[PDB]
Symmetry: D2
Subunit: 315 residues, 4 copies
Amino acid sequence: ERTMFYGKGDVYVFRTYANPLKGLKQIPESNFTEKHNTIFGMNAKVALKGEQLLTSFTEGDNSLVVATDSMKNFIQRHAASYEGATLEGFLQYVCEAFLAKYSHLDAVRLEAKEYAFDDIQVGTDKGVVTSDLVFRKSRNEYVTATVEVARTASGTEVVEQASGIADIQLIKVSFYGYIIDEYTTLAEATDRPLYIFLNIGWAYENQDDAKGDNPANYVAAEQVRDIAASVFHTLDNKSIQHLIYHIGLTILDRFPQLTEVNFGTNNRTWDTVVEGFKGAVFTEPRPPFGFQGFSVHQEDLAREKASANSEYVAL
Amino acid sequence: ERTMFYGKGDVYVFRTYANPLKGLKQIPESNFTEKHNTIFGMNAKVALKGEQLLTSFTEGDNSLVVATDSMKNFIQRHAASYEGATLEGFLQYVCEAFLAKYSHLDAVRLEAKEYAFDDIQVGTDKGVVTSDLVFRKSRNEYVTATVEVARTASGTEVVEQASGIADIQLIKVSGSSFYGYIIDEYTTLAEATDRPLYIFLNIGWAYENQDDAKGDNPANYVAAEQVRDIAASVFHTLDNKSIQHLIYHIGLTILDRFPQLTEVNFGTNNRTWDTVVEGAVFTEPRPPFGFQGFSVHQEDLAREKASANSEYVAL
Amino acid sequence: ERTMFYGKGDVYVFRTYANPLKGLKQIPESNFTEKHNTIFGMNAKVALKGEQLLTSFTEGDNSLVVATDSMKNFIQRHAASYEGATLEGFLQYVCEAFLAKYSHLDAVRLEAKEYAFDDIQVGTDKGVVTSDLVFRKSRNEYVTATVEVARTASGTEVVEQASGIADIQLIKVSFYGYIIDEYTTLAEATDRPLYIFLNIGWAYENQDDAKGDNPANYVAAEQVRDIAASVFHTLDNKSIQHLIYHIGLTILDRFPQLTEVNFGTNNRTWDTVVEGTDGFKGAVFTEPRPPFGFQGFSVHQEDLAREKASANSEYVAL
Amino acid sequence: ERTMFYGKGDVYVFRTYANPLKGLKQIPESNFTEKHNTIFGMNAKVALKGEQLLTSFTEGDNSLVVATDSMKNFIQRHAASYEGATLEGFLQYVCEAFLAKYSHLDAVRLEAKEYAFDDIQVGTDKGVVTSDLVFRKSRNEYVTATVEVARTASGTEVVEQASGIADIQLIKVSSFYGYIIDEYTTPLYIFLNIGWAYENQDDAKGDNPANYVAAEQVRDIAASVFHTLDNKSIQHLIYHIGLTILDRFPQLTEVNFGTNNRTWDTVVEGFKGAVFTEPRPPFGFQGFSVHQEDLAREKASANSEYVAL
C-alpha cells in the first residue's frame, strides 16, 4: 500500500469578477449574506494519483506524466471558465476536469487557501463609502477547502471534502479545577484576557451543497467566523475546550445540513507584568502554547436539545 | 564618531484600558475620529546611549550598565503609569523617564510597532453590534513611532520624532497605467495603459510642533488611521501613471489635510500581477518588486495649489 | 470516532550532555558514525488522548485535566532523567511515563523537531580544530520523530513511530517525454541545475531499534541525509521521481532493518536568464514564479528485492 | 533636500562558474583561503537617484524613467559579463555600468545578500569527498555588501561601501554581574551581524586577493574569539572580536557590530543533566564600532587584556 502522488503547489490563481455568492442563510450571529467575488483568489495545490504513475518513479518513464507546469496551466484556465461562486465548487470542477481529460489518472486532490481581500472605506464626493475599485490584501483569517475526487464504478465521486476558516485570532478582555501534583508550577495564578487562535472546519451531509448551486444550503466561512466571535463574546466560558464545544453546537444548530464541526486551537494568553484590567500591563509568554483538537456532531446537538440540564443557548 | 548603544528589543507591552484618543480632526477621506485604546499594545525597542558606556565595552565593566532586563521592567511599569493616549506620547514619556532616573545616560531612543487589534461585529439580542469585549488581532497595517531624547544643559530635547503607518497592502484592479518609459536594449516590459497595481505602503510624517504628537490636544494629533484612509481614498480616486505619481498625490493630500505637518515620507513597494487568461485570471509574478523612497513637503503643496498646470485635486 | 485531544506545543527542551550516540553502522555514503549529544535539543509537541477527557469539553469539567503547563514541566524534567541517546528513545520514554503517571489517559502522542546545532572550526594554539564549547545554531536540515503510545489490556504499545530528516535543500550543477497537449506551455525548454527540497522518513521492522540501545541497528538521520546527497551526486537522474526511487532503494539496501522509506519533495529549479556559453559556464539564473513541483512516494524492501532480481535494473550502489 | 529614489528589490541573480576567489591572507583563526564561486548568487536591490527623476513623481512623466524591470534585466546581464570574484566588485561594476549607460542618473546604489551554498561530503568510489556537483542551500550566515557610486567632475566615485557577514548564531557551552541594582532590577547564545570598512576601497574588488577580506574569515575570527575569551558580557566580547579582526586585517579602518542576546532559561539545574528552554521574546542588543585607533591603544597599554593567536 505505497504512497504515490505528484503535482504542483503554490498555484496562485486570481480570477476577477467571478459570479457573486448571494442568498446565504440569514442567522442572528452574522450580517454576512453575500460575497461579491470581485476578486476570487486562492493559493491552490494539486496532486494527481493513480497506479499507472508507478513507472514514472521506478523507471523514470515520463510517458504518462502530465507536466506539473501543465497542471498549473490547467487550473488557471479553468478559473476563467468556472461559472460558480464558491471555493469548494471551483475545486470540484477542476478535479472532475482533470479526470475527464486524463483517463490514466484515478484520483485528483485539490487543496486551497483563499488569497483574502477586505472591502475598504474611501472618502468620495458621495461621502465615505465602500470602494468597488480598491481592496486590502488581508493577512487575517482566510477560507480553506480541500476536494479529492476519485473514479467509481459508475463515474467519479468526491471522496474527501473539507471546508474551513483558518487563523481566527481573538482576545476577550473579560480556569480552575485541574489536576494538581508534583508537575504543577509552584507559582500564584493571575487573571489574563483569554487569547485564542482557532481553525474551524466542517463537513456536509450532502457534499453537493458545498458547490453553492443553491446558496441557501451553502455555509460561508465568514458566517462560521461570526458565530465563533459571537459565542466567544456572549458565553462565560470555563475553558477553551468548553468554548469550542459551544461554538460547534451553535454552528450545527444554524446549519443542520452539516454533519460535524471540527476545531484546532491555540491558547496564546499573555503573561501579567502589572496587575490591574484597569491599569493592567501584560506581555508575551514563553513560546509553549496549549492546544486542543475536537469535533462536534449533530448527535451532540440533538442530545443537548433533548437534555433536561443542558447549558446550551442560542440567539 | 564611534557607534555605541545597547538595549532591549521585542519588549512587548500590552496596556489595557488606556485613556481613549478622542476629538481628532474631521476630514473628508475618513470617518476615524477616535481610538478607544481598550488595548494599547506595542512591541517596543529601547536603546541607551552615553559616552560613559564606553568601558562596558572596552573593559567589560558593568558598573554603569543598566541591565537590559531592567530596561524591560522600566518600560512595562511605565506602561501602567502613562496617562496619555498616543504611541508618540508614551515613547517620549519613557525616554524622559530614563534620562531622569539615570544621570550617566546622554540619550535614549525608543521605537515601537503597534500590536494592533480590530473591532469586530457580534450577534446579540439587540442585533449585530460592535463588541466591547472581543477583538481580533490584526496582521494588517499597524502604527509606528520613534522618539529619541537627548540631555541638554537646560533639560532634555527631542532629537528624533517619527510617526507612521506600516504595511498597507492595497490592490486596484484596473485603471492604473505605466507607459512612456525608456525603451532601449534592456527594455522587455510592455507598455500599459491599464495594468493591475498592487502596492505596499509605509507612510511617515513629521510635525512642525513636536508636542502635537503627545495628543494633549487631539485636534492637532494626526492618527495613522486617518493617513491610511487618505492613502486608500487617493488610490481609489486618482488615475495614477505610476506608483511614483500616486505617492506624490497621497503626500500632497495628507499635507493638505494636516497643515501642522512639515513632511510626509514614503517607503513603498510595487508588484503587478501577471496575466494568465486575458479578459480575467492573474497569478503571482516572479519575486522582484519595484520600490520607491520619496518625501513631500508643504512647499510642494503650495507650489501645486498656485500652478495653472497642477493636476492635484482634493475632496 | 470523534476527534478529541489536547496538549502543549512549542515545548522547547534543551538537554546538555546527553549520553552520546556511538557505534552506528559504517556505510560507504557517510562518515557519520557518532553524534556527541553535547546539546540534545528539540521543539516537542505533546497530545493527550482518552475517552475520559470528554466532559472537559462537554461540561467544562477540568477534574481530569492535566494542565498544559504541567505537561511542559513533565517533558522538561524527563529530559534531565533520560539516559538514552536518540530522539525516538526520548519520545517513547516520555509517552510511557505520561501513561504511568495518569491512569485516565488512553494514549499519548509526542512529536519533535530537532533544534539543530553544527560543530564548527576554531583557531586555537594547537591549530584549527573542532570546538567542544561553541556551536552554530543550524537553520538547515533537522531530525524529526513521532512516537504515540496507547494503553492495551495488558500494558502499552507503540501505535505510531516515525523518524525523519526535514528540509534537505540540494542543487546539482550538472527531463523529457511528458504528455504534450493543449495545456502544455508553448515555449522552448532550457537546461537548469536541478534544485530539490527533500523530507525523508523511514520505518523500522523492529521498532525498539529506534531506541538506540544497540546503535548498530539505529539509523541516524544524518546517515540518510548523506545517502541522499551521495545518490544525487552520482546518479544521472531522469526526474525527481526517478531520483527519489533510487535514494530510497539505497537507504533500504544499507539498512535492511527498515521496512520503508518515504519522501516529500519540492522542485525548486531556477529559471534561465542568460544561457551559458558552454555548459553552465557563464550562465545566469533567477528565481521562478512561485508554483513548485512536488512528489510523495514510498519505497519498500520488496522494491529493492525486485531490482536485485531484475536483469534490466539500473540500480547500483557503492 | 527631499528623499527621492526608486528601484528594484529581490533581484535574484545566480551566476554559475564565476572566477574563483583565491589567495586570501592566511590567518590563525581560519582555514578559509579560497572561495570557488561555482555558484555566485545573491539577492540584489538597486536604487537609482537623480535630480532629473523629479517629474516622474510630480508629473507622472516617465520619459526619463528606466523601468525597474529593465534594471532587473541590466543586473542579470551584467552577472554574465562580470569577470571578478567578489560581491563588492560585482556591485561596483554594476553601479558604474548604470551610470555609464544613463547620463541623467546622479547615483546608483546596490545592496546584496548572498544566496549562500555549502560544500558537502558525498560517498564515492574514491571514498568520502567534497562534491564538485552538489551543494546545500544554506539558511545560516551569509555575506552582505553595499556599494553606492555617484558622479564627480572627472568620472565617478564610491560614496558608500559596506561589507559584512549576517546572521551568525553561536552558543557557548560553558558572565554577567556588577550592573546597576535599583528598584527596576530583577549559557551564552548570541546573534551577530559584523561589518567592516576598507582604508583603500579598491581592496574590496579582489584584484589583489591578499588584500581582500573574506566574510568567512571574519566569521571564523568571531567564532574563535568566542571560543577562547572568557567574556564579561557580549559588549566585552564584541570589543575583542573587533580588535582581533583589525589586527589580522590592518587594511580595515573599522569593524561594526549588531548583536542579539538569545540566551536560554534554565528549567533543570545541572551542565551535566541540565535542561534549558526558550526565554520570553525580549532580547538584549548592542551596536558598536571598533577602530584601528582602539587596537593601537590596546597594543601599547599596560592596562590592556588583549591577546591574539
